[PDB]
Structures are given as structure tokens and as C-alpha cells.
Amino acid sequence: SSQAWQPGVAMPNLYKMQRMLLEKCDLQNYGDSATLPKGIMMNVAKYTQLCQYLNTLTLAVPYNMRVIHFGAGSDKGVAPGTAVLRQWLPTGTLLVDSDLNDFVSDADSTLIGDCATVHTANKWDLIISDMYDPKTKNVTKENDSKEGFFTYICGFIQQKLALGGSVAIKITEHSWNADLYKLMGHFAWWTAFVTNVNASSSEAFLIGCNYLGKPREQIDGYVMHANYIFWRNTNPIQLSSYSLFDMSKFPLKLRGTAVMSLKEGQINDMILSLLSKGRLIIRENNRVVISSDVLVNN
Amino acid sequence: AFAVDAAKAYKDYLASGGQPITNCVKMLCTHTGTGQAITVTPEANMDQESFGGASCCLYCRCHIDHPNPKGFCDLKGKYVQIPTTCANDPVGFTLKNTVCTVCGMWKGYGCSCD
Ligand SMILES: C[n+]1cn([C@@H]2O[C@H](COP(=O)(O)OP(=O)(O)OP(=O)(O)OC[C@H]3O[C@@H](n4cnc5c(N)ncnc54)[C@H](O)[C@@H]3O)[C@@H](O)[C@H]2O)c2nc(N)[nH]c(=O)c21
Ligand SMILES: C[S@@+](CC[C@H](N)C(=O)[O-])C[C@H]1O[C@@H](n2cnc3c(N)ncnc32)[C@H](O)[C@@H]1O
Ligand SMILES: Nc1ncnc2c1ncn2[C@@H]1O[C@H](CO)[C@@H](O)[C@H]1O
Ligand SMILES: [Zn+2]
Ligand SMILES: [Zn+2]
């Protein structure tokens, strides 16, 4: 009802609990476009609504927060979503972005190359991915779980996301991965979030809120993607730009969340409860050092 | 002594009726900000638009060296406020205009020290 005044719509809990078979996604409003404010790019609007929704969750926000953003380049050669993330995040937050193709960015550091080439010494408090393979468009066969950059993202989260950290990873009807839904069960909570400005697309951000580093819930990713599509198929979302007009409470709250080093041995129920509530980040607090592997040939 | 002069070439291109650089990244904001020129977060007032700084920098956009002993960029990682009446060409506005060293407003579009 009041849905059109929200930044978007999160998949309701009851849909996550279903056991649906995967069907073709057929949206009532497919192809329709929101009316954006004058001179605002779709990707600025979309990232603004994602950050507006992330403001409602218990994200951990330490001093010297570290955020990495994959799929940050555009066909325009600039990085609108990075500009939004930099606007939203506390001043001084270290933001690294990356894409296959060259682009100009406001991030503190940018790596150009296939995501599989990206390595980082440090862990991260927030991972955002907008990666999407143009070839996903060439649908021949049945819609099966995809590998490619999703394989990398799953490994990257498990190896490099701090406990208590969060993720938002873009999926669509055909661009999705079963193991990534499975990994949503390793967070204190998760959802699939659809921006109101892009409500006519099967796009969603799969959001994992406060990473626990082990399964809290066993999720079957084939079934969960089917549940997501069933929700989309049966719940038309009205395109809306409304939330773009009120930016007065936009910046992420500076919570100053504690960061601690803890070994495998010391993560008990007490610690898991703090991680779960967005009150703790566990990782080293050394320098941030990243690199991209370069294949040399002739 | 040879050096590409991107700044002049762009001024020359504009003067002969060329279309300004597009795809400067305009931010959503309150438009109730300080109105200063180059800031850590969008600060547009009612008379301005805020843009992602890298996207409004000629040197960043043309993939060329920034013109100064160490290749430092004034705009990248920051937000630039552009008067609405000039927001059709943010790159040209930043090229042609100067920031007041004292109050941080644009000379001629906000700075009132003189
Ligand atoms: C959801 N859906 C999918 N299809 C069909 O299935 C194909 C693959 O479906 P998809 O997984 O790509 O999802 P969808 O079409 O909803 O994605 P969309 O184009 O809205 O793209 C979502 C986001 O992905 C990114 N993206 C899309 N194309 C590109 C690209 N070429 N390059 C980079 N990013 C891209 C952008 O971020 C974009 O906003 C579609 O191209 C279409 O033939 C549909 N057909 C009907 N008739 N009705 C539907 O509801 C429907
Ligand atoms: C929808 S576009 C990103 C738009 C961008 N987030 C913005 O803010 O406008 C998807 C991006 O994912 C990138 N991408 C796709 N597969 C990738 C991969 N394997 N490695 C790195 N980037 C990849 C593309 O090059 C492309 O620029
Ligand atoms: N991590 C979270 N941060 C904030 N609100 C949450 C979170 N998890 C769940 N919610 C709320 O509880 C519901 C799922 O429990 C959501 O639909 C919302 O009402
Ligand atoms: Zn520059
Ligand atoms: Zn002045």
C-alpha cells in the first residue's frame, strides 16, 4: 500500500519458507521504466534505494570501515554506484572498486580485470557486487545455477568477509547461483531486495546481514531461487521514485562498532550474539593491500 | 617542451559548438548544503547540483595526466557543486572556474570575499 514510499520491497519471510519449483519469470510491468528526477541516472537511483534499505538493517559500521565494490564500471566509463556508496558511507571509509572494463572512479583504489584476478590481504566489512554477464541474455537451455563470477564471490565472502560483515549481491532471473543462496544461511538474517525504481526487472540484491562464518540455517539454493521467482511472479511491484526525494536521513549511521581479533577457539555464544546484532566485527585491523593478477603472454 | 593541452582543446571544441562531455554523475541530495565548491559529501544548495568529482574532471575522463608536479586530482573521491544554470557542462565549469582559497566557494558563483 504504502509500499510505493519505501526504497523498495524485501522478499517476505513466508515466501522464503516455501518449496516452489522454478518457473519462467513473467512480470506484469516488464519493460516499464520509472520516471527519474531530472538528470538522475538509473544506477544512481538504484544504489540510492539499496543504501536507503541497508539503513534499516543492523549493519556493523566500525571506525575505518572497509568496503569493496565489484562490477562498479559502466558502459559510460564512470562509476555511478561507487559515487553513491561514497556518499552513503562515513567519511574516511576505505572503498575499493573493480570491474572487467576500464572506468573512472571516486573509490580510494580501483582494480581493472576479471574479478577472479582480485586478491586482498585484509578482510572487508561490506561487499557489494553489481556484476552481471551480458551473455546471461542468450538464454537457450533451462535456467540453471550459474558459475563464473558467482563462484568467485562465494569463495571471496567465505575467505575475506569479516564476521559481523554484510553483503549485497545483484542477481536476476537468469543471473543467480545456488551456493550464494546457500551462503545466505551463514548470516544472522538475509533477504532479496528489489529497488522500487527497477521494480519492473527480475533484478534483486541478495543481502546477507551480519556474517557468522558458519551455517545458522541450511538453505537449498535451487529451491530458494524458485521461491524468489514465485514471489516476483505473484506480487507485482509498482515502479516508484518517491524515496529518492528525501535524502535528509541518507548517510549510514556512524555506529563505531567494535573490531576485535579472535581466533577460531574464542567464538562462543556470547560473541555470536554480538555478531548477530550488528554490535561486533571480527578481523585484523592491519593495512589494506590489494592486487590484481596479470597474465603475461605475447 | 611539447605537452598535450587538453584544457585548451576542450575550450576550443566548446567554442566551436561541440557537445559538452556527458555522463557526469549527478547525486541525489537535499539541496540544503553549504554550497561550497568541492566537498567530502554533496553540499549543493538550492541553486546547484552535486556531482561525483571524478566524472567531472577533464583529466580523469580523457584518461590523461593531471597537470602538476605530482599527478594529483582535485576532484576524484570528492563531490563538486555546479550552479544549476551551468550543469549541462560540469567538466567545462570546473576547467574554467576557480575556488576561493578562503571561503571555499566558487569565485563568481558564491564567493563574496571581494
Ligand atoms: C524477468 N524476465 C526475464 N525475461 C527474459 O529473460 C531474459 C534474461 O532475464 P534476466 O535474467 O536478464 O532478467 P531481466 O530481463 O529481468 O534483467 P534486466 O534486463 O532487467 O537487467 C537487470 C540488470 O542487469 C544489468 N544488465 C542487464 N543487461 C546488461 C548488460 N548488457 N550489460 C551490463 N549489465 C546489464 C543491469 O544492471 C540491469 O538493470 C530477458 O532478457 C528476457 O528475454 C522476461 N521476459 C518477459 N517477457 N517477462 C519477464 O518478466 C522476463
Ligand atoms: C550492470 S553493469 C555495472 C553498473 C555499475 N554498478 C554502475 O554503478 O553503473 C555490470 C558490470 O559487471 C561487470 N562484470 C561482469 N562480469 C564480470 C567479471 N567476471 N569480472 C568483473 N566484472 C565483471 C561488467 O563489466 C559490468 O561493467
Ligand atoms: N538484520 C536485521 N536488521 C534489521 N531488521 C531485521 C533484520 N532481520 C530481520 N529484520 C526484521 O525482522 C524480519 C525478519 O525477521 C524482517 O522482515 C524485519 O521485520
Ligand atoms: Zn581527475
Ligand atoms: Zn571567498
Residue numbers in the entry:
A (entry chain AAA): 1 to 298
B (entry chain BBB): 18 to 131
Cite, word for word, the article reporting this structure.
To understand the determinants of RNA cap modification and help guide the development of SARS-CoV-2 antiviral therapies, we have now succeeded in solving the high-resolution structure (to 1.8 Å resolution) of SARS-CoV-2 nsp16/nsp10 in complex with the methyl donor (SAM) and its target, RNA cap me7GopppA1. Even though SAM was not included in co-crystallization or soaking experiments, its electron density was unambiguously identified in the difference maps (see methods section). The binding of the Cap-0 substrate results in an ~180° outward rotation of gate loops 1 and 2 from their positions in the binary structure displacing them by 7 Å and 5.2 Å, respectively. The resultant widening of the pocket allows accommodation of the RNA cap substrate, and engages the N7-methyl guanosine base of Cap-0 (me7Go) in a deep groove formed by residues of gate loop 1 on one side and gate loop 2 on the other. Gln28 and Asn29 (gate loop 1) orient outward, whereas the side chain of invariant Tyr30 rotates inward, thereby forming a cleft to stabilize the purine ring of me7Go through a π-π stacking interaction. In gate loop 2, Asn138 rotates outward and the side chain of the invariant Lys137 rotates ~180° inward and forms stabilizing electrostatic interactions with all 3 phosphates of the Cap-0 structure and the 3′-O of the me7Go ribose. The methyl group of SAM is positioned 3 Å from the 2′-OH of A1, available for a direct in-line attack from the 2′-OH. Thus, in our ternary complex structure, Lys170 best matches the one activating the 2′-OH in other viral 2′-O MTases (e.g., Lys180 of dengue virus NS5, and Lys175 of vaccinia virus VP39), and likely serves as a general base during 2′-O methyl transfer in SARS-CoV-2. Unexpectedly, we observed electron density on the opposite face of nsp16, >25 Å away from the catalytic pocket, that was consistent with adenosine, that we had included in our crystallization mixture. Thus, the lack of extensive interactions for adenosine and its high temperature factors (compared to RNA cap analogue and SAM) suggest that this pocket is probably not specific for adenosine but could accommodate other small molecules with a heterocyclic ring.
